[PDB]
Design a protein around this ligand. Structure first.
Ligand SMILES: [Zn+2]
Length: 257
């Protein structure tokens, strides 16, 4: 019964998921004055030419755009990573107001939203195996600010009416996730966790330096989604973000000078 409400939000998750107070929790604040350039980091390689989106699902916590992950169709490699990571889904976290919504922060700045492209390490065979490994997942995080529209987001926005409530899904084929990337692939990286229960410490985080812009109308449509199921009292799906967690015995590395 975890969520982001008045009585089940992030500050409560530790009771059912005690690693919520663990050593490698996410998100974190990225202090640009202490993250150090690491010349041993490599560019990242984002290979989404062959990506097969399938479906979009309102899971009661966000919406997931799901991919074929039964071959090396959409992969993330390079950067800080060893080996190959398959795209399984992407989703967002966003606010009720434009001054909040991101999970990671940059010098304490909150963005309006944050996109997570979730990938699993093919050495482990399936996502469920991967999440049990410290190097099982690679999550590419991209900040959203409100300004111009993002054309590549509009087909996501326009399907949201069909998945308003928890448990609804819709066919969502032929979506190109390249349309959600910023110009630059400069990034910060650190070891952390899933930001939702079960909060497993299985993630190499790769957070892009450059935000994307979305319009105020696009974010407004995110904010019309519902946490609740059909026929239940309406609870707008807003503020579905976990706040920054203690960095502890970690360093954030920068790919850029
Ligand atoms: Zn996420």
């Amino acid at each position: 019964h975890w969520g982001y409400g008045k009585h089940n939000g992030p500050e409560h998750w530790h009771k059912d998921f005690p690693i919520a107070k663990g050593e490698r929790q996410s998100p974190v604040d990225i202090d640009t004055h202490t993250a150090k350039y690491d010349p041993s980091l490599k560019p990242l390689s984002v290979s989404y030419d062959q990506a097969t989106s399938l479906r979009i699902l309102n899971n009661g916590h966000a919406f997931n755009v799901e991919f074929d992950d039964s071959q090396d169709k959409a992969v993330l490699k390079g950067g800080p990573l060893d080996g190959t990571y398959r795209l399984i889904q992407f989703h967002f976290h966003w606010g009720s107001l434009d001054g909040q919504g991101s999970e990671h922060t940059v010098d304490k700045k909150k963005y309006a939203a944050e996109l997570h492209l979730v990938h699993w390490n093919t050495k482990y065979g399936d996502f469920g195996k991967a999440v049990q490994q410290p190097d099982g997942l690679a999550i590419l995080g991209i900040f959203l600010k409100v300004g111009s529209a993002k054309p590549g987001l509009q087909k996501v926005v326009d399907v949201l009416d069909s998945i308003k409530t928890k448990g609804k899904s819709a066919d969502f084929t032929n979506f190109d996730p390249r349309g959600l990337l910023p110009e630059s692939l400069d990034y910060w990286t650190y070891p952390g966790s899933l930001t939702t229960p079960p909060l497993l410490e299985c993630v190499t985080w790769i957070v892009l330096k450059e935000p994307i812009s979305v319009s105020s109308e696009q974010v407004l449509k995110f904010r019309k989604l519902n946490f609740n199921g059909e026929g239940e009292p309406e609870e707008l799906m807003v503020d579905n973000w976990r706040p920054a967690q203690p960095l502890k015995n970690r360093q954030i590395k920068a790919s850029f000078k």
